Design a protein around this motif. Structure first.
Motif, mmCIF file in Angstrom:
data_model
loop_
_atom_site.group_PDB
_atom_site.id
_atom_site.type_symbol
_atom_site.label_atom_id
_atom_site.label_comp_id
_atom_site.label_asym_id
_atom_site.label_seq_id
_atom_site.Cartn_x
_atom_site.Cartn_y
_atom_site.Cartn_z
ATOM 1 N N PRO A 110 129.229 10.684 71.235
ATOM 2 C CA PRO A 110 128.318 11.310 72.296
ATOM 3 C C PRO A 110 126.924 11.941 71.509
ATOM 4 O O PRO A 110 126.737 11.700 70.784
ATOM 5 C CB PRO A 110 128.802 12.725 72.303
ATOM 6 C CG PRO A 110 129.094 13.307 71.630
ATOM 7 C CD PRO A 110 129.344 12.249 70.310
ATOM 8 N N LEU A 111 125.722 12.471 72.445
ATOM 9 C CA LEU A 111 124.201 12.825 72.401
ATOM 10 C C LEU A 111 124.585 14.197 71.826
ATOM 11 O O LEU A 111 124.746 15.076 72.504
ATOM 12 C CB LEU A 111 123.536 12.092 73.194
ATOM 13 C CG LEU A 111 123.174 10.550 73.124
ATOM 14 C CD1 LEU A 111 121.961 10.729 73.778
ATOM 15 C CD2 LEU A 111 123.056 10.194 72.029
ATOM 16 N N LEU A 112 124.714 14.746 71.190
ATOM 17 C CA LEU A 112 125.053 16.091 70.369
ATOM 18 C C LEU A 112 123.491 16.884 71.196
ATOM 19 O O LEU A 112 122.681 16.539 71.138
ATOM 20 C CB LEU A 112 124.479 15.964 68.551
ATOM 21 C CG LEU A 112 125.846 15.948 68.395
ATOM 22 C CD1 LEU A 112 126.225 15.835 67.318
ATOM 23 C CD2 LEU A 112 127.312 15.971 68.668
ATOM 24 N N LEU A 128 119.669 11.035 70.128
ATOM 25 C CA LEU A 128 118.931 9.585 70.109
ATOM 26 C C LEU A 128 118.054 9.342 68.943
ATOM 27 O O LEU A 128 118.673 8.076 68.332
ATOM 28 C CB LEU A 128 118.687 8.374 71.637
ATOM 29 C CG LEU A 128 119.451 7.423 71.302
ATOM 30 C CD1 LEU A 128 121.038 6.576 71.111
ATOM 31 C CD2 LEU A 128 118.092 6.301 72.543
ATOM 32 N N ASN A 129 117.525 9.369 69.093
ATOM 33 C CA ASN A 129 116.627 8.838 67.454
ATOM 34 C C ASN A 129 116.923 9.570 66.342
ATOM 35 O O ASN A 129 117.426 9.047 64.715
ATOM 36 C CB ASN A 129 114.863 9.418 67.928
ATOM 37 C CG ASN A 129 114.764 8.493 68.159
ATOM 38 O OD1 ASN A 129 115.037 7.586 68.561
ATOM 39 N ND2 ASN A 129 112.962 8.695 69.315
ATOM 40 N N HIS A 130 117.769 10.660 66.272
ATOM 41 C CA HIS A 130 118.567 11.072 64.820
ATOM 42 C C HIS A 130 120.043 10.796 65.218
ATOM 43 O O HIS A 130 120.026 10.169 63.950
ATOM 44 C CB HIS A 130 118.970 13.331 64.885
ATOM 45 C CG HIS A 130 117.305 14.099 65.054
ATOM 46 N ND1 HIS A 130 116.452 13.609 64.157
ATOM 47 C CD2 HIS A 130 116.636 15.029 65.605
ATOM 48 C CE1 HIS A 130 115.481 13.976 64.376
ATOM 49 N NE2 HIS A 130 116.118 15.577 65.079
ATOM 50 N N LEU A 131 120.363 10.773 65.785
ATOM 51 C CA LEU A 131 122.022 9.343 66.272
ATOM 52 C C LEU A 131 121.167 8.841 64.967
ATOM 53 O O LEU A 131 121.945 8.321 64.258
ATOM 54 C CB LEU A 131 122.429 9.198 67.075
ATOM 55 C CG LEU A 131 123.682 8.014 67.389
ATOM 56 C CD1 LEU A 131 124.589 8.731 68.248
ATOM 57 C CD2 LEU A 131 123.686 6.793 66.692
ATOM 58 N N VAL A 142 128.374 0.963 66.177
ATOM 59 C CA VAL A 142 128.676 2.529 67.366
ATOM 60 C C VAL A 142 128.717 2.812 68.557
ATOM 61 O O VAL A 142 128.049 2.036 69.224
ATOM 62 C CB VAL A 142 127.048 2.917 66.300
ATOM 63 C CG1 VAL A 142 126.994 4.402 67.411
ATOM 64 C CG2 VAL A 142 127.144 3.680 65.300
ATOM 65 N N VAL A 143 129.751 2.708 68.931
ATOM 66 C CA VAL A 143 129.564 2.894 70.638
ATOM 67 C C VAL A 143 129.202 4.709 71.612
ATOM 68 O O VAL A 143 130.054 5.602 71.607
ATOM 69 C CB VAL A 143 130.618 2.872 71.695
ATOM 70 C CG1 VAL A 143 130.603 2.302 72.764
ATOM 71 C CG2 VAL A 143 131.268 1.502 71.082
ATOM 72 N N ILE A 144 127.777 5.090 72.093
ATOM 73 C CA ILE A 144 127.037 5.946 72.835
ATOM 74 C C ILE A 144 128.003 6.136 74.031
ATOM 75 O O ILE A 144 128.467 5.462 74.794
ATOM 76 C CB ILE A 144 126.292 5.894 72.590
ATOM 77 C CG1 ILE A 144 125.525 5.505 70.933
ATOM 78 C CG2 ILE A 144 125.196 6.623 73.432
ATOM 79 C CD1 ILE A 144 123.561 4.683 70.886
#
Ligand SMILES: [Cl-]
Ligand SMILES: [Cl-]
Ligand SMILES: [Cl-]
Length: 163
Positions: A110-112, A128-131, A142-144
């Motif tokens: 998930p997006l933290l 998303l950019n830190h992910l 990777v599945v968001i």
């Protein structure tokens, strides 16, 4: 590793994922919580045994043989923009270490810090950019996971922009 490591996005409950492990958007105290964390507690309650971990860290606990990576993003209600940005980057770096250590071929994430820890801001792009910064050097698929229709479109656009 995956044969051709990819990013994908799905709009659905991460508790129904089709990946080899899951990242929980955890609180530091290992409590059932709300949102993603409560869905994860209902599906994998055994994984909350000694799951408490500080902000900016990840702690893996097995539910059977299925790994639950508890990743603690900062609550932007309490952190400054600057310190929160540092801790959010750090949490995703620890997720990449855990995914690598576990030797999985795929991970649901998930997006933290985008929900009740967002301090009422839109942090899709920041999170998303830190992910990506953390996960780009890993070879897992990777599945968001997200729940909002407009977020699905924006995440899908950001993935396709790099391809
Ligand atoms: Cl669903
Ligand atoms: Cl959140
Ligand atoms: Cl969402």
């Amino acid at each position: 590793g995956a044969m051709a490591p990819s990013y994908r996005v799905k709009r659905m409950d991460i508790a129904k994922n089709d990946e080899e492990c899951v990242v929980n958007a955890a609180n530091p105290r290992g409590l059932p919580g709300d949102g993603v964390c409560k869905a994860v507690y209902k599906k994998w309650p055994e994984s909350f045994k000694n799951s408490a971990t500080p902000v900016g860290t990840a702690k893996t606990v097995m539910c059977g043989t299925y790994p639950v990576i508890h990743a603690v993003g900062p609550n932007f209600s309490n952190y400054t923009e600057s310190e929160g940005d540092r801790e959010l980057a750090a949490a995703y770096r620890e997720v990449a270490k855990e995914v690598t250590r576990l030797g999985v071929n795929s991970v649901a994430i998930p997006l933290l810090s985008t929900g009740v820890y967002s301090g009422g801001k839109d942090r899709l792009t920041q999170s998303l950019n830190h992910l990506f910064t953390a996960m780009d050097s890993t070879d897992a698929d990777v599945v968001i996971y997200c729940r909002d229709k407009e977020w699905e479109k924006k995440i899908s656009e950001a993935i396709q922009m790099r391809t």
